[PDB]
Amino acid sequence: KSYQERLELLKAQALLSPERQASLEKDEQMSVTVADQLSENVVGTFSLPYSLVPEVLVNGQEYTVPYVTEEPSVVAAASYASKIIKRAGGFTAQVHQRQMIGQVALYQVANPKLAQEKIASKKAELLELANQAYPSIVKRGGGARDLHVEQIKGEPDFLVVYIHVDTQEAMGANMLNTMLEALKPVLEELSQGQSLMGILSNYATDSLVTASCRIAFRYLSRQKDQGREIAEKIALASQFAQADPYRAATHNKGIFNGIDAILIATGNDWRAIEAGAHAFASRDGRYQGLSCWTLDLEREELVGEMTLPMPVATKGGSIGLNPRVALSHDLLGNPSARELAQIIESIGLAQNFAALKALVSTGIQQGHMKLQAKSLALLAGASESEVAPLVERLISDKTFNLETAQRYLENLRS
Amino acid sequence: ISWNGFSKKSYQERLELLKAQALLSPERQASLEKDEQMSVTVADQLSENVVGTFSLPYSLVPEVLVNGQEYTVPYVTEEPSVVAAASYASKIIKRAGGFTAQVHQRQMIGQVALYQVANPKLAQEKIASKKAELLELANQAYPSIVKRGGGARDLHVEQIKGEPDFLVVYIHVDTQEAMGANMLNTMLEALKPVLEELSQGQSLMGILSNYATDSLVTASCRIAFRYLSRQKDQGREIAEKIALASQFAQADPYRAATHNKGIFNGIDAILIATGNDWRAIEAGAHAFASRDGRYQGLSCWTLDLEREELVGEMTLPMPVATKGGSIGLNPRVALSHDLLGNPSARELAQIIESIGLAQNFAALKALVS
């Protein structure tokens, strides 16, 4: 469909209220005046494409997901993956926890063991102090929930106080930074040490979210053995990303083609999600692929699963200022942060699935066979003028290999 | 002329000050003054299912001094204080002589993964013995790049034991001003048949790698203590605390993630402005951060007590581009490159690397002060 036909179709689907639909048809943008409130030294605005990924089925609810990407084929891939996985029942997703982590680092602590025990014994008192430093969140039902103290040996040694905070629908960088700043004096007195910093942590292991899918082999190919072969290769591709960091970077980049597209569309901080997830990818001592694809040979199903820190937000940042971000949240039915996180996780896994399927699939047939035959021609030692006759003979056979290329090369020259 | 007063100037006055700097041609200045955006029609050719466009702020970071050359850096970010921090850091570091940056190598890596190789050692030697023949085969698969002076330069083979074992053929390719995903993927498709024949194995995939360790770029600065504070000794204390914060990021992954995020507030901002793939740079760099077995901070700040200097350094994979993709289709991306003086990709990599370190400096300074 054309651009305009896409708008008519979206209008007929009634996914947007009449006002939002009109806004989108006028392609309403954040104004320079509002942009001037989001950033500094603003001299204009910058536009990217805004696309829709239909039929994203998460926990039995179907969504049309907005994407902002400049990379060709990314949206098409996500739509393709979503369609297949919808046939296979959609995604199942869950939030394990949703809390943000902040830390105060202390140094020059003469007696770290005692300091650790003193601080741990004042846990409730210190959590009450953080809550009083930012009193709005407790009134609204959130707040600082836990505290842990760790010694980190090295050059020099650090004593690190971590707080775990329920920030509800917000990202909470300012909340944690305010709470941590209030804790510094008492943490110094309790430890008799020096406060180095108090800052939120983007290694958001209190906000893990998991999505999965289960794809019968028949959705991968009609030829019974073929679908199994595609599934087997996708699992092998997932295993390869576990073995080679050079593959892992590309595997995970492919996930974030999708994730970053919907983060931008929803006003979320993708540098934060990227950092937390790529750090999560090396928690076992090696940088590895973030998702796992495995075979269910008994059920003949390909199983995909991906766990990430996904501390996204539905309030704050530009979510209220950029009008198209507001439209994106409306388009999704105004999900909570937890629901949004589960949608984003599914999208990331969908994006990954389309990449792996394309990576492992072979045989352009008509054109691929001439590519194959020319490579074998050259390896056989064909010179420049011999290549075209060679390829022509090869591709005209039911099958061929290097030995065929070499034998025909000898016929050519003899 | 001076950039003083630029942040407090109105939008209209900022544009006038930019005009006074004579950084842009009449057409580009006009384009910016009308805030010209990529149209829906052009967007419709860059992506699929397009139903509109999405706008973000566009800002300038002036006085970025890299290898004796001064730049006005464009930023696209939605996070308050990011542009201000980068501008603050850049001015201080310009006072301190600016950045020194160098490109160690500029090549892309692609890989073919082979499995079911009965004799990996033999396959490894057979493949190595046809190296020159394989490199020429790859170059003929994408002959336009060779006409421009690039192409496949090297090829090596590794056994990666595991479940199962893989035999991996890596190619190292000079992609010139492009990122070269299509170039490498095309060469790799051509290599699959012959690599399978040589190895007597099965090709699993042939794809470029975003772990771009053949494209490392290093940037550094040396900031006298007196540029960190007017009160003198306070400057040394700030230097000491920034070095400590850098060390904390070597010790705790919970800190390293935030440290590295803070770097990419800046890097991704200029990547978007120049039409480059920020997922690719993010992935390779975060992968680089755990090369020593632990996820660690990507930059190092150290005290030079003897010279009374705070020293900053950062090495990253930075395979950025000046040709291809949306580069040139989005009118503001074309404008961003003109704004930088149309740097080569190598030059741009050095500017971006410097920007990331500048951003990092402002984050750490604000954190410990």
Ligand SMILES: NC(=O)C1=CN([C@@H]2O[C@H](COP(=O)(O)OP(=O)(O)OC[C@H]3O[C@@H](n4cnc5c(N)ncnc54)[C@H](OP(=O)(O)O)[C@@H]3O)[C@@H](O)[C@H]2O)C=CC1
């Ligand atoms: N994991 C990944 O990163 C992957 C990314 N991509 C996406 O593809 C794009 C990057 O791939 P890429 O191959 O670089 O882009 P292109 O496919 O568009 O190829 C680059 C084009 O620029 C031309 N050109 C002009 N000058 C030069 C020069 N000095 N050096 C090289 N080329 C020049 C080339 O030659 P000419 O016009 O004369 O033929 C060619 O047409 C990005 O959008 C990326 O996101 C795609 C697949 C995988």
